[PDB]
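Practice problem 4.
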C-alpha cells in the first residue's frame, strides 16, 4: 500500500541515507560529492522557509520516493529532488508522485512549473515529455566544486498549468 504526503522523517537521518543512495545510483547526472554541499535536510528547510514544500512516497512505512517544489516568483515554481527508488521505478509511481506535486502547486496558485535535468536521465526526460513539458534550452552547465570542475549537459523545461 503506497501513500503520498508531506515529508516527515521516520528517524533523524532517513532523508540523508535515502538521498545519498539515489544520488549514487545516478552517477552521470548529479553531483556526487554530497559532503561539499548543504545537507538535503537543510535544502528541505530552505524550501519550506520560502513557501515551498517537500513530499514523500511510502510503501507502508518504507520511504521509496521524494519530490520537491521550490517557488521562483508569484506564479512560477521549480520541480526538484524528484527521485523514486530503483526497485520501484517504471511502474507508474513517479508519474503519480509528480501529479500530486503539480496539483498542490496549482492549488497554491502557481501557473508555471519549470525544471532542469541532465540529458543522461532518460526516464525523467521521457516522463516530462509525457506530462507535457516543453523544452526551453539545452546547455552544458559548468559547476566548480572544490578542486574539480564538472560539466553537465542539461535540458530546461516549462509547463503551463493555467
Ligand atoms: C526536476 C528533477 O528533479 S530532475 C531529476 C529527475 N530524477 C532522476 O532522473 C532520478 C532517476 N529516475 C527516477 O528516480 C525515476 O525514474 C523518475 C522519478 C524520474 C520517474 O519515476 P518512475 O517511477 O521511474 O516513473 P513511471 O513509472 O511513472 O514512468 C512514467 C514515464 O517515465 C518514462 N519511463 C519510465 N521508465 C522508463 C524506462 N525504463 N525506459 C524509458 N522510459 C521510461 C516513460 O515516459 C513512462 O511513461 P509510460 O509508462 O506511459 O511509458
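Answer key:
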Amino acid at each position: 500500500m503506497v501513500t503520498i504526503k508531506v515529508f516527515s522523517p521516520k528517524y533523524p537521518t532517513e532523508l540523508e541515507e535515502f538521498y545519498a543512495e539515489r544520488i549514487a545510483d545516478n552517477p552521470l547526472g548529479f553531483i556526487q560529492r554530497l559532503d561539499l554541499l548543504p545537507s538535503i535536510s537543510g535544502f528541505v528547510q530552505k524550501l519550506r522557509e520560502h513557501g515551498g514544500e517537500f513530499f514523500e512516497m511510502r510503501e507502508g512505512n518504507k520511504l521509496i520516493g521524494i519530490c520537491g517544489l521550490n517557488p521562483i516568483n508569484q506564479t512560477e515554481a521549480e520541480l526538484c529532488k524528484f527521485h523514486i527508488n530503483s526497485a520501484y521505478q517504471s511502474q507508474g509511481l513517479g508519474q503519480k508522485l509528480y501529479e500530486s506535486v503539480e496539483k498542490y502547486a496549482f492549488i497554491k496558485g502557481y501557473t508555471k512549473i519549470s525544471l532542469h535535468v541532465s540529458k543522461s536521465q532518460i526516464k525523467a526526460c521521457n516522463l516530462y515529455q509525457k506530462l507535457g513539458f516543453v523544452h526551453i534550452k539545452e546547455e552544458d552547465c559548468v559547476v566548480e566544486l572544490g578542486e574539480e570542475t564538472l560539466i553537465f549537459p542539461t535540458l530546461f523545461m516549462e509547463k503551463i498549468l493555467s
